[PDB]
């Protein structure tokens, strides 16, 4: 509620504001102060979910996803402060502004208290993130990057304002998730398919399927700075959650034809894994990553019968830290050596020593150690998607074993000897390398502790 | 309505008005108080904060515009409404009174997974 | 010479006026008869050897645009023989009325003149003024509104915001760029008239703005695409901040108010429970964006500054009322549900 | 010389033409960087009347 | 000159600010003759306000106050440096043209202002049309190439276009075979050995393209000599008005032309000089290179980033 | 005008396949020469002979399609169930766009024909059929 | 001076937190429920609406 | 002796000084009208 | 950036702020 | 009755292609400013044989325009052949 938006909008003239240099730490310190408002009146209910007003609902919801968004951003000023040191102050008055002003919406968003809020604020992003890949860019393929990430994005996600304006004057009023107490069916026509697939097929081009994700490696191969958009770029995605809103219900009772949304994304999920492997660009590597075990949960949504929901929740937030981390390893180790290309750093782990064990635990949790979120987020997925039929064992079985061998190369990749032509290299991780680093994998593996509080209602 | 070209008539009399402090009020010429900021900013003033004649004198014209508009508009989804209710009062042949059902009655499909 | 051309300057609204304030068929000839009148003589201005070869390709395209309407409002005069202002009483009229008015807002078709005429009308100060043009026909319109064959003002139109949206995708000239995706916007405008007339005037206003506030700042001296990427590292950079928060806007993304037209008219062209028009239109407005994009590749992106060029004076042109439009052309959408019963 | 490209010929690729998208058919001509004066001037000399033995 | 509409229509000038008295003038000169021992001398007699030539600083010579800035900020080949003829260099020979060019028209465009707001005469040193002079010389001595020669013609016919020629335009008096001494026996220790070519090509090349405007409307005057020199001063002072009376102007086109109510041609040569950011505003760069004059983006395009400073220093508030 | 659709789209519907493609190689042959009027307007044709054999030859081209396309499913339409079916009027489509393809040669167009010209095929009987309107009044 | 810059925003909180409690006036129009949601007797409805 | 026009200087404060005059002129005159009409 | 400073994120002092203004 | 079928079929003197060609525009121009008496007598008629009594001024105000700027659109091509001595409306030079 408003004891969020004001503070944050608050945080905006916080900055310009200020002096030079004491700006960064002058919106860092501030910026991690909100996380207190944001537990705050937050983790109330639980049952006869939380609404505080007519057209915010904060997050009830068992959705919570909305303490994480406010984590990132003063990660990122820790994060991008690398070779944005090097242009102007007013312009580096800009990119934290802007960066501000994509945090305002996310918060908008996850509350909307209905349909018509989330959508105009579900393409309300694109223009904060559309500026922070063009401009500051380090290759020049960054000019096709700022295309594709349109039209696709927009592209179908206009035939939702016409679906969702055809629902608002059909049954009631849609002014209200809360109320869907009348709803009726969707039996079969030939419109309705398009109806439900109106609703749909706009949700999907975001986190991808195996089609249609011609965009997402476009973007993150060649994009800002730290990864400083990146790490934001990471949590947009899984951000399409609202797919849990509608499939609920608005058209629950078809499930006739979704069937091409499972077979075309569960045989991508053994593809696109395997196509990784051979890789010769490190952010590419880990780009491929977050296609695969994101696009599990499509296949989680789709079918009812929480168990899944349990376990489709903790995987929005499950990568949504590590495959938010590795992004800021690969980052670090290319500060000092100006290449992305994976070969080229190798005879590591004896110059930094101590980034070792940050390597490790980061490239363990896609292992998915059985005590972490990360499998008691996998499986609730197994345990009902087998209940649907039997053989689902297999596939998904076979990616528990690609992407073992995925994860180590990346590291042991790291373990030769090379001393070879390199007089770079010499920082030892100053402590902002391995503070940004941290801040992760502290309350990542916490919460298996108490873990009822990442969780659906089921 | 009736009383053609006239910006409003004398029936909006018997209406509120919409007095201040509406947040709407305070953004109109907000969104001028952001404007006036550009105003020097473009010819390199380069103050960011120039005279405050021209600083202000902005602030003074929406709200008062922005006022004085917001007191028809609400007027005229007023004169909707009238005339809609008016005519869904008479005809009662086109607006039923349906029937009262709970559940003892309705099947709905019945398709669970 | 400075007297007059504020009273020539001052009868073309008084062409204007006489359109909007009339019962009569007779004045709205005259009306905009005397526009193609006292339209010419300021694309003169410089007497060059292309306004003269321009406003000539002009004229006789809006002689006899003018010139089939007096047969067209002669023929109702046979039929019922009362003139006014109102349906046409016969079918002749108005098939002859709305497809040869289309004429002077050009449509889908009869546009092979407003690229003809906006490019290379030497004088760029404007030709703002052909934003009037715009506005003298749909104050007939608005008023004939309940006459039409209604299996036609859709045919120019869904044949217009297509055709004036591939024509620019092609285009480097900045006046040409304009002048298309200026066919584009009366796609939208006319593809609406016959439900609901009202959140037509909707788009017509939001675009009288928009169009408007990009030339003032088309004017320093900015005339080539390539002439724009001179621009960030010589004339202020607080300018390109500007030419990027319009030109997207003007396309439009929800955020911004550019987005506040198609917002609202999808609520009335659905509800009439035609859905399988508005895609159609409503996507191809997006191809209609590759234009702008593209456009705004060239500013941001510190394009080779021209050359060694010092620019160390200030400015003194008018920019008058530019330091307000774009917070009326951008920030509004936030604003009004009143442009429905506003207007009205 | 890092950051990113905004190099030599990406100007002259919208350089002023028709700027064929896939294929060139007819280019128009750079237009006049002035006000327009491509075309031709005509002046007659002058008329030759002799007046005569009259 | 007009201020706008309003300044216009209430009062202005026409032939109320030029009594015959206005006589706009300029001189010639070769390599080291006729600079400042003749023009300068003469402002009065007829109390003509005289204007300096040529030069990298002469807009830095505007705006101030005025105490010059370096040669990065306000860049050009820096005169003694060009005199290597570099016909291999970096380069360039030609840039230094630009900004000897872009002052060029700085100048003319400052005078045609001073007459309408005043009236006086003004006498030049080398206006834009005696200027090709150099370009034989530059151009048939090898050091500019091809496609910058034409470049700045490309320019030459665009930027010059309302301009009133000059009426009483002066030849300098010639020492024929010698400035190979003036230039020796006065110093300049960087104007130097260069050779017959940019020495004896010129001179051949003042008369038979100058020639044009010398027998353009503007009636001309002619010396070869030593120079004026106490014996032909009172001569162009008194009798070079007796030539710029009655047998004065021949087509005239300095008349402010026909538009001379104060109209169409009249105040719009006034209107156009005054903010003279649209002076030079065709000068500005064509689609992408020409090879030689060009600043890059970044590299070395930060030395915008150091004249970046506010760019208005003082204005204060409340006013 | 309008009605050729009219009896179109009434008597036949699945059955008596000769006159469905007798009716629709006229529409698809009608619009030949819609496009043939902009081609010598718009691009110049100076052949007094030379000019309208090519206008012909384009017109003629243009037409191929109509004509077998009401054949490619009638056929169909007659022998699997014998009424027509969303999935049984595609058929003409893509071996009917293959005619335009079979023209001028394939690779880049003749797939592309056979998709598009595939895909937008069945939406028109699925229109109707639904009860769709594209033009409509409240 | 006295550095407004700094924690005087976090007092946009409070001036925040206030305004959730500006429409609970407005809100109060259910002091009727079956579920205790009570409102029966006591003086605790009373306040808080 | 800092030099704006003194002239005009001061209108648009005294301008802006007759407008919310006469805005709530118009106000407090308006807002009895309500219950003066109701 | 090594003149044998220690240094954590930019310069000579808040840089020291700068620490505590993060791990505390 | 029959004379308004003629002049009707004089009223398509638009005949278009020779509404602005071939040159020699001058021969174009003048089917325009012979397009009245199609407008104008057919309207002379209407108006005429019902006795209107009050509109038959309009047939002189459909002149007293016809004239005035037909009149002026005559103006430019001078200034065409002007700077030619040949209209021919060939000259295209402004493209797109
Ligand atoms: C949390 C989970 C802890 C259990 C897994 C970690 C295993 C222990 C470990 O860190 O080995 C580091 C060790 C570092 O090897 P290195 O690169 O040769 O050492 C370089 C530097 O010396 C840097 O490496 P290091 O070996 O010196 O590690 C630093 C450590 C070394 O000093 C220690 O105190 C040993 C830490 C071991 C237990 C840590 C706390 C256990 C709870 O110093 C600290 O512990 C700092 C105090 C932190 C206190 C935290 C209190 C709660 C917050 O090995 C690893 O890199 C991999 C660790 C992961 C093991 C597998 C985990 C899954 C099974
Ligand atoms: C002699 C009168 C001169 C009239 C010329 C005025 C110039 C008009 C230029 C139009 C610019 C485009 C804006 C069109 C929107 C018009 C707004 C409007 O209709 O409100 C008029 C208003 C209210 O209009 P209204 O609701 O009472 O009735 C007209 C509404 N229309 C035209 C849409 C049918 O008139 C006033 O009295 C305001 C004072
Ligand atoms: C609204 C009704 C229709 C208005 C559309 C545009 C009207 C413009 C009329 C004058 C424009 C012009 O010629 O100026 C050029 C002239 C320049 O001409 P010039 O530079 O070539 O030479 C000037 C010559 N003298 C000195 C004689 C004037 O002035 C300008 O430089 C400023 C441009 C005018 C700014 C546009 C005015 C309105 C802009 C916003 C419109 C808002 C509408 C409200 C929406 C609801
Ligand atoms: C004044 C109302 C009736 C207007 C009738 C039209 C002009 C009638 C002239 C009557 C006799 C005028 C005596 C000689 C003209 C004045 C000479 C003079 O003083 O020059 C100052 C000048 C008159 O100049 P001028 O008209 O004599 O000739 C100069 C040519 N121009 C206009 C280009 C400068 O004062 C003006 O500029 C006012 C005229 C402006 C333009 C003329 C058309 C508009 C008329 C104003 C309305
Ligand atoms: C493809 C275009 C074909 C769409 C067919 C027409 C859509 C339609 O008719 O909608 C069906 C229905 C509304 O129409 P109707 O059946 O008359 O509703 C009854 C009202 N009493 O019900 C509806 O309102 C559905 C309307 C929303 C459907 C809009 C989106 C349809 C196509 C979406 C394609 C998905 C993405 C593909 C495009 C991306 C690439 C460009
Ligand atoms: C404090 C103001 C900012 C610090 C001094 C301003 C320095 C300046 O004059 O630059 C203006 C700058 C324009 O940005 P740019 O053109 O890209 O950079 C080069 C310009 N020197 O940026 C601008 O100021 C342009 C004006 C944009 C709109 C005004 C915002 C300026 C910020 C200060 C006022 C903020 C008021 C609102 C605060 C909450 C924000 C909603
Ligand atoms: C949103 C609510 C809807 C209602 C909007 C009402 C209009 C708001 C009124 C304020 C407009 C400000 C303006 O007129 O232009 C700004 C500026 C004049 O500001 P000023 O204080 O006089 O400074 C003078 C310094 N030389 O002017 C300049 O920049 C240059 C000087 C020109 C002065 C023009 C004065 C025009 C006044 C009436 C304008 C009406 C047209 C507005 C255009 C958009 C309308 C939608």
């Known amino acids: 509620m408003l004891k969020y938006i004001i503070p944050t909008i608050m945080l905006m003239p916080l900055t310009w504001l200020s002096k030079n240099n004491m700006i960064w730490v002058n919106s860092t310190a501030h910026s991690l102060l909100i996380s207190f408002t944001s537990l705050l009146l937050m983790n109330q209910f639980g049952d006869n979910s939380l609404n505080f007003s007519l057209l915010f609902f904060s997050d009830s919801l068992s959705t919570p996803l909305l303490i994480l968004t406010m984590w990132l951003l003063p990660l990122m000023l820790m994060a991008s402060q690398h070779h944005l040191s090097k242009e102007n102050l007013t312009r580096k008055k800009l990119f934290i502004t802007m960066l501000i002003s994509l945090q305002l919406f996310l918060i908008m968003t996850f509350t909307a208290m209905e349909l018509i809020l989330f959508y105009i604020l579900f393409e309300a992003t694109l223009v904060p993130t559309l500026i922070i890949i063009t401009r500051w860019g380090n290759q020049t393929e960054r000019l096709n990057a700022g295309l594709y990430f349109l039209f696709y994005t927009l592209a179908g996600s206009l035939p939702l304002l016409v679906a969702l304006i055809y629902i608002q004057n059909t049954v009631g009023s849609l002014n209200f998730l809360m109320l869907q107490y009348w709803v009726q069916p969707v039996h079969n026509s030939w419109s309705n398919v398009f109806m439900w697939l109106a609703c749909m097929m706009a949700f999907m081009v975001k986190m991808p399927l195996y089609g249609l994700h011609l965009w997402l490696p476009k973007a993150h191969v060649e994009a800002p700075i730290a990864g400083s958009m990146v790490l934001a770029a990471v949590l947009l995605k899984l951000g399409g959650y609202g797919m849990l809103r509608i499939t609920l219900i608005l058209n629950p009772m078809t499930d006739f034809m979704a069937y091409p949304f499972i077979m075309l994304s569960l045989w991508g999920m053994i593809m696109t894994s395997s196509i990784c492997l051979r890789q010769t660009d490190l952010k590419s590597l880990i780009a491929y990553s977050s296609v695969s075990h994101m696009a599990l949960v499509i296949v989680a949504i789709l079918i009812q019968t929480p168990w899944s929901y349990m376990g489709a929740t903790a995987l929005m937030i499950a990568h949504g830290l590590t495959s938010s981390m590795l992004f800021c390893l690969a980052n670090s180790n290319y500060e000092r050596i100006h290449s992305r290309t994976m070969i080229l750093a190798r005879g590591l782990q004896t110059l930094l020593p101590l980034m070792a064990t940050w390597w490790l635990l980061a490239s363990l949790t896609n292992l998915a150690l059985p005590p972490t979120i990360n499998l008691i987020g996998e499986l609730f997925v197994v345990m009902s998607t087998f209940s649907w039929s039997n053989i689902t064992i297999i596939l998904m079985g076979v990616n528990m074993v690609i992407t073992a061998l995925y994860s180590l190369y990346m590291l042991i990749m790291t373990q030769r000897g090379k001393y070879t032509y390199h007089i770079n290299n010499i920082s030892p991780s100053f402590t902002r390398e391995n503070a940004l680093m941290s801040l992760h994998i502290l309350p990542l593996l916490l919460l298996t502790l108490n873990p009822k509080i990442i969780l659906g209602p089921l | ?113 | 010479n400075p007297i007059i051309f504020i009273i020539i300057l001052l009868t073309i609204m008084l062409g204007t006026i006489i359109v909007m304030i009339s019962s009569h068929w007779l004045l709205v000839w005259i009306g905009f008869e005397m526009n193609m009148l006292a339209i010419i003589p300021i694309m003169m201005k410089n007497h060059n050897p292309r306004a003269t070869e321009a406003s000539t390709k002009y004229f006789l395209t809006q002689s006899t645009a003018s010139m089939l309407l007096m047969m067209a409002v002669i023929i109702n005069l046979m039929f019922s023989g009362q003139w006014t202002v109102m349906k046409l009483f016969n079918p002749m009229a108005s098939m002859l009325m709305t497809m040869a008015l289309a004429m002077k807002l050009g449509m889908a078709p009869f546009h092979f003149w407003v690229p003809e005429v906006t490019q290379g009308i030497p004088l760029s100060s404007g030709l703002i003024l052909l934003t009037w043009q715009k506005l003298a026909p749909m104050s007939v319109l608005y008023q004939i509104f309940p006459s039409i064959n209604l299996n036609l003002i859709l045919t120019l139109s869904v044949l217009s915001i297509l055709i004036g949206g591939w024509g620019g995708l092609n285009q480097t000239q900045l006046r040409k760029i304009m002048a298309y995706s200026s066919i584009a916007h009366m796609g939208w405008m006319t593809a609406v008239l016959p439900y609901n007339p009202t959140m037509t005037l909707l788009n017509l206003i939001i675009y009288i703005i928009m169009t408007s506030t990009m030339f003032t700042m088309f004017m320093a001296n900015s005339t080539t695409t390539t002439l724009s990427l001179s621009h960030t590292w010589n004339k202020t950079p607080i300018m390109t901040v500007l030419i990027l928060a319009t030109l997207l806007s003007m396309g439009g993304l929800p955020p911004l108010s550019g987005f506040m037209p198609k917002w609202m008219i999808i609520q009335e062209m659905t509800k009439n429970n035609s859905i399988i028009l508005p895609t159609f239109m409503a996507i191809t407005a997006l191809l209609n964006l590759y234009f702008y994009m593209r456009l705004t590749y060239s500013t941001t992106l510190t394009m080779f500054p021209s050359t060694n060029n010092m620019k160390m004076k200030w400015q003194f042109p008018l920019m008058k009322k530019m330091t307000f439009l774009p917070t009326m052309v951008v920030l509004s959408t936030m604003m009004l549900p009143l442009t429905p019963m506003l207007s009205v | 010389a890092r950051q990113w490209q905004p190099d030599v010929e990406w100007a002259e690729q919208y350089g002023g033409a028709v700027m064929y998208p896939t294929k060139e058919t007819a280019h128009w001509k750079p237009p006049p960087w002035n006000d327009v004066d491509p075309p031709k001037d005509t002046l007659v000399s002058n008329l030759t009347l002799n007046f005569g033995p009259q | 000159l007009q201020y706008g509409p309003l300044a216009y229509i209430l009062g202005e000038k026409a032939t109320k600010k030029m009594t015959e008295k206005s006589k706009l003038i300029t001189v010639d000169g070769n390599i080291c003759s006729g600079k400042s021992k003749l023009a300068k001398e003469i402002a009065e007699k007829l109390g003509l306000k005289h204007f300096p030539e040529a030069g990298i600083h002469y807009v830095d010579s505007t705006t101030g106050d005025g105490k010059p800035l370096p040669v990065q900020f306000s860049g050009n080949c820096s005169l003694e440096k060009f005199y290597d003829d570099p016909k291999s260099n970096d380069g360039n020979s030609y840039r230094l043209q630009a900004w000897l060019y872009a002052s060029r028209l700085l100048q003319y465009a400052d005078a045609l202002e001073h007459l309408l707001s005043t009236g006086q005469g003004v006498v030049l040193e080398r206006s834009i049309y005696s200027d090709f002079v150099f370009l034989e010389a530059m151009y048939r001595q090898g050091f500019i190439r091809k496609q910058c020669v034409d470049h700045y013609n490309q320019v030459k016919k665009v930027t010059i276009c309302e301009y009133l020629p000059p009426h009483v335009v002066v030849y300098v008096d010639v020492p024929v075979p010698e400035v190979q001494s003036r230039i020796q026996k006065k110093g300049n220790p960087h104007e130097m050995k260069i050779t017959s070519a940019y020495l004896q090509d010129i001179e051949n090349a003042y008369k038979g393209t100058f020639l044009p405007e010398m027998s353009e409307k503007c009636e001309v005057l002619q010396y070869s000599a030593w120079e004026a020199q106490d014996a032909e001063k009172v001569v162009e002072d008194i009798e070079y008005l007796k030539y710029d009376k009655g047998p004065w102007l021949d087509q005239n086109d300095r008349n402010l032309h026909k538009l001379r109510m104060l109209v169409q041609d009249k105040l719009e040569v006034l209107n156009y000089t005054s903010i003279p950011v649209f002076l030079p505003e065709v000068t500005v760069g064509a689609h992408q290179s020409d090879q030689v004059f060009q600043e890059f983006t970044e590299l070395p395009g930060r030395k915008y980033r150091a004249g970046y400073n506010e760019d208005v220093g003082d204005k204060w508030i409340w006013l | ?138 | 001076r006295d550095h407004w810059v700094h924690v005087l925003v976090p007092m946009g909180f409070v001036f925040g937190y206030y305004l959730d409690r500006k429409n609970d006036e407005k809100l109060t129009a259910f002091r009727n429920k079956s579920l205790l949601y009570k409102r029966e007797l006591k003086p605790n409805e009373e306040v808080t609406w | 002796h800092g030099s704006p026009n003194w002239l005009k200087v001061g209108l648009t404060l005294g301008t802006s000084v007759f407008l919310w005059i006469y805005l709530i002129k118009q106000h407090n005159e308006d807002v009895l009208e309500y219950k003066r009409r109701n | ?24 | 009755s029959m004379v308004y079928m003629n002049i009707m079929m004089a009223f398509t003197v638009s005949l278009v292609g020779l509404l602005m060609y071939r040159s020699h525009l001058m021969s174009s121009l003048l089917c325009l400013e012979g397009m009245m008496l199609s407008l104008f007598v057919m309207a002379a008629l209407t108006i005429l044989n019902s006795h209107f009594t009050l509109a038959s001024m309009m047939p002189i105000i459909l002149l007293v325009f016809a004239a005035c700027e037909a009149a002026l659109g005559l103006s430019l091509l001078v200034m065409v052949s002007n700077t030619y001595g040949t209209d021919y409306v060939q000259n295209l030079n402004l493209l797109q």
Not at chain 2, 13 to 18: A, E, I, Y
Not at chain 6, 125 to 133: C, D, F, I, P
């Open chain 2, 1 to 113: 309505g009736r009383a053609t070209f006239q910006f409003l008539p004398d029936e909006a009399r018997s209406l509120p008005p919409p007095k201040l402090t509406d947040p709407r009020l305070a953004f109109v010429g907000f969104l001028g108080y952001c404007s006036g900021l550009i105003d020097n900013a473009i010819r390199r003033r380069p103050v960011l904060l120039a005279g405050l004649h021209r600083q202000l004198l902005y602030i003074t014209s929406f709200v008062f515009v922005g006022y004085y508009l917001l007191k028809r508009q609400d007027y005229m989804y007023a004169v909707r409404d009238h005339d809609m209710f008016s005519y869904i009062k008479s005809h009662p042949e086109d607006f039923p009174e349906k029937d009262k059902k709970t559940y003892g009655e309705v099947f709905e499909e019945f398709h669970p997974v």
């Open chain 6, 1 to 138: 005008a309008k009605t050729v659709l009219r009896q179109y789209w009434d008597i036949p519907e699945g059955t008596e396949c000769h006159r469905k493609t007798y009716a629709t190689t006229s529409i698809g042959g009608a619009a030949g020469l819609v496009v043939s009027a902009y081609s010598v307007a718009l691009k110049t044709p100076t052949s007094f002979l030379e000019g309208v054999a090519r206008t012909g030859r384009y017109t003629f081209t243009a037409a191929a399609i109509g004509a077998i396309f009401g054949l490619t499913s009638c056929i169909s339409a007659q022998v699997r169930e014998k009424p027509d079916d969303p999935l049984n009027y595609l058929i003409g489509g893509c071996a009917g766009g293959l005619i335009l393809g079979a023209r001028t040669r394939s690779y880049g167009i003749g797939a592309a024909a056979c998709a598009y010209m595939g895909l937008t095929a069945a939406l028109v009987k699925m229109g109707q059929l639904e009860g769709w309107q594209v033009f409509a009044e409240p």
């Open chain 9, 1 to 24: 950036k090594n003149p044998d400073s220690h240094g954590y994120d930019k310069d000579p002092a808040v840089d020291i702020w700068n620490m505590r203004v993060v791990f505390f």
